C-alpha cells in the first residue's frame, strides 16, 4: 500500500471507492476546497498496481483560546476489495497525528447511526460519543438518518 496525497486527476479514479451506498461524491467545488485549504488531511492509499484502495478527507476548523480547535474527518472510505486490511485504522491514525501536530484538542466525526460497522470501528479506535444530530443527512425521497457526532480528545493543546 502506497500512502500519498490525493492529487487532482485522482478524482477520475475513485470509482471503486465511491460506488458504495455509504460513500458520497460531494461534487468538484468540495474536493477543490479541501485540496486548496487543507491538503494535509487528504491522504489517499494506492495499491501495487493502480487500484485506489481508499482515501480520507479531513479539515481542522475551530477557534483556539476556547478549546474548540478540532480536527474534523469529512470523509473516509476503503474499496470493498481492500477492506479488513487495517487500512482505515492507518488513515485515521495519520489524521489523528496530523491534527495533533498542529496543536488540536480533539478529533471530530459525523457517522450516520445506521451502520454498526463504522460506529463499532470508531468505538474501538477510541472515539467516544457526543451529541446525536437529528435529521442531519439531508437525502439521497429516502428518509433522513440521524448522525452521531463522535469526538476523541487527544493530547490537549492550544
Amino acid at each position: 500500500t502506497t500512502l500519498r496525497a490525493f492529487t487532482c486527476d485522482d478524482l477520475f479514479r475513485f470509482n471503486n471507492i465511491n460506488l458504495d451506498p455509504l460513500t458520497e461524491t460531494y461534487g468538484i467545488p468540495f474536493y477543490l476546497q479541501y485540496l486548496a485549504h487543507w491538503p494535509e488531511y487528504f491522504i489517499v492509499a494506492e495499491a501495487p498496481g493502480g487500484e485506489l484502495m481508499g482515501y480520507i478527507m479531513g479539515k481542522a476548523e475551530g477557534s483556539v483560546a476556547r478549546e474548540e480547535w478540532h480536527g474534523h474527518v469529512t470523509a473516509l472510505s476503503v474499496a470493498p476489495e481492500f477492506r479488513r486490511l487495517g487500512l482505515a485504522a492507518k488513515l485515521m491514525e495519520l489524521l489523528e497525528e496530523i491534527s495533533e501536530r498542529k496543536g488540536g484538542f480533539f478529533v471530530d466525526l459525523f457517522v450516520r447511526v445506521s451502520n454498526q460497522v463504522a460506529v463499532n470501528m470508531y468505538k474501538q479506535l477510541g472515539y467516544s460519543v457526543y451529541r446525536t444530530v437529528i435529521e442531519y443527512y439531508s437525502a439521497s425521497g429516502e428518509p433522513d438518518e440521524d448522525a452521531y457526532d463522535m469526538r476523541k480528545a487527544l493530547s490537549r493543546d492550544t
Binding site: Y26, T74, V111
Partner: peptide
C-alpha cells in the same frame, strides 16, 4: 462522511 451541501 459529511452531508453534500
Amino acid at each position: 462522511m459529511d452531508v453534500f451541501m
